[PDB]
């Protein structure tokens, strides 16, 4: 009942629009591994645009000025917020529905991440164009936790690799079981085959 | 909707259950009845609009329903009490319907089961 969207390979604004609309529909959407978000254009132009965003600041009192968050998750959260009427109760409620995290926390690492093809880089961008990684851009602009997040990602990928090996051996045992038991489950298989479920 | 088809009741107290359809009454309603031994459905009227009809029918052209039951027979009188004639007619029609439905494999269990919607089940996509 809660969407878990993988941020790897997703264009920033293209994914944000889908997330914002889905949240406005009342869904609970969580975006994971925001450091894998791609942004169109060359990396220099993207960082130049963000540097201009940094320069834009209230002059008399910077404490009241625009809050430039450096974490990739909060950058994505801000860009989703820009697509919502956050000045209203429904907009703030939608922002409360949305939860954004950098990396893959333990509450969501054991689940399966969803991918939206409508915002995928390899679908919505030509192979000859240049793109920038949000995590690399954030580290360039002042994110202080690229290395620790990378180590944590490495550790969980290793653990997930072990889990995938066990899943593979379970599947192999299942198919061996099916081959050995087809003699006494034949009448329960042809029905599915005739109804287009096992062909 | 043809005589001998299977219907799904959605509104009344017997909602979501699959019932056998007999004929159209003079009041415009559908005279429906399931095997009471299967899904606890007596000889009951139902509305054509409020009923979903599926593509599973049995040939009941060789059965004879009693002609003494009509809209006045099923009209409400005024705690409710079951008359002896209701049980007699229900047994008389069950003795002709139940053996016929039992010819079709796995039909009694289907009638005993109920209809429900799970996740990913959409009436527009599914065809019954």
């Amino acid at each position: 009942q809660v969407l878990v969207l993988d941020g790897r390979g997703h264009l920033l604004g293209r994914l944000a629009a889908i997330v914002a609309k889905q949240v406005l529909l009342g869904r609970k959407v969580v975006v994971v591994r925001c450091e894998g978000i791609n942004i169109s254009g060359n990396f220099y132009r993207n960082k130049l645009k963000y540097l201009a965003f940094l320069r834009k600041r209230m002059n008399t009192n910077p404490s009241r000025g625009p809050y430039h968050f450096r974490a990739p998750s909060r950058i994505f959260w801000r860009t989703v917020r820009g697509m919502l009427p956050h000045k209203t109760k429904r907009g703030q409620a939608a922002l409360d529905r949305l939860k954004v995290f950098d990396g893959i926390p333990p509450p969501y690492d054991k689940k399966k991440r969803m991918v939206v093809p409508a915002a995928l880089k390899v679908v919505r961008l030509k192979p000859t164009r240049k793109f920038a990684y949000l995590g690399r851009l954030a580290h360039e602009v002042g994110w202080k936790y690229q290395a620790v997040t990378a180590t944590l990602e490495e550790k969980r990928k290793e653990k997930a690799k072990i889990h995938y090996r066990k899943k593979k051996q379970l599947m192999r045992l299942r198919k061996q079981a099916e081959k050995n038991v087809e003699k006494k489950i034949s009448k329960f298989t042809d029905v599915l085959k005739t109804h287009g479920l096992l062909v | 909707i043809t005589p001998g088809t299977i219907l799904i009741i959605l509104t009344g107290r017997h909602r979501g259950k699959r019932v056998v359809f007999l004929k159209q009454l003079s009041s415009g309603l559908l005279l429906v009845t399931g095997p009471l031994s299967l899904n606890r459905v007596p000889l009951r009227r139902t509305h054509q609009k409020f009923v979903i009809a599926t593509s599973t029918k049995i040939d009941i052209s060789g059965v004879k329903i009693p002609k003494h039951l009509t809209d006045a027979y099923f009209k409400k009188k005024k705690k409710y009490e079951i008359t002896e004639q209701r049980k007699v007619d229900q047994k008389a029609v069950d003795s002709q319907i139940l053996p016929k439905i039992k010819a079709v494999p796995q039909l009694q269990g289907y009638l005993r089961s109920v209809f429900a919607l799970t996740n990913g089940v959409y009436p527009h996509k599914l065809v019954f």
Binding site: L3, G9, I18, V115, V116, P117, A118, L120, V123, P127 | -
Partner: protein, 176 residues
């Protein structure tokens, strides 16, 4: 005129009204392309007025019919001569296309001319369209397709129908 959809080739003949000076004015036939005969006749009068001393009132239409492609099932290379107005000054062009129908080639000519030179339909006026053999073709973009043993794959299959599986768990494959 605007090239709305595929154009249709119209054969239109016209002549001046009979006058006490001359009983039988000459009949003039033109090949035109237009969305429908209503604008086709307007284009014919525009060209005839620009060519001869004939006008809408001083003349009249005779027959405005549609010419169908004689061989719509054979791929043909078409050379099209154009005379359009640019930002400053007008130019004469010769462009080669490859299509089954003459009208379709003209439609494609209107499309890519507007794409490449911003030349709108009212600026573009057609003068001569004919079927040109592959040997007589000159543009390499058209000559490259003149190969009996032509063979090429589809390298990158961009994923269409994006929003049907909109929320899925599978990374799409572009190799087939």
């Amino acid at each position: 005129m605007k090239a709305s959809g595929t154009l249709r080739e119209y054969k239109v003949v016209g002549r001046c009204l009979p006058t006490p000076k001359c009983r039988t004015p000459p009949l003039y036939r033109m090949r035109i392309f237009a969305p429908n005969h209503v604008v086709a006749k307007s284009r014919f009068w525009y060209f005839v007025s620009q060519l001869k001393k004939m006008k809408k009132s001083s003349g009249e239409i005779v027959y405005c019919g549609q010419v169908f492609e004689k061989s719509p099932l054979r791929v043909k290379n078409f050379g099209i001569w154009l005379r359009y107005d640019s930002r400053s000054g007008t130019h004469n062009m010769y462009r080669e296309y490859r299509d089954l129908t003459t009208a379709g080639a003209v439609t494609q000519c209107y499309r890519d001319m507007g794409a490449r030179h911003r030349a709108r339909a009212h600026s573009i006026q057609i003068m001569k369209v004919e079927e040109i053999a592959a040997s007589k073709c000159r543009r390499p973009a058209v000559k490259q397709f003149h190969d009996s043993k032509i063979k090429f794959p589809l390298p990158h299959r961009v994923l269409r129908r994006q929003h049907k599986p909109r929320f899925t768990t599978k990374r799409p494959n572009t190799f087939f």
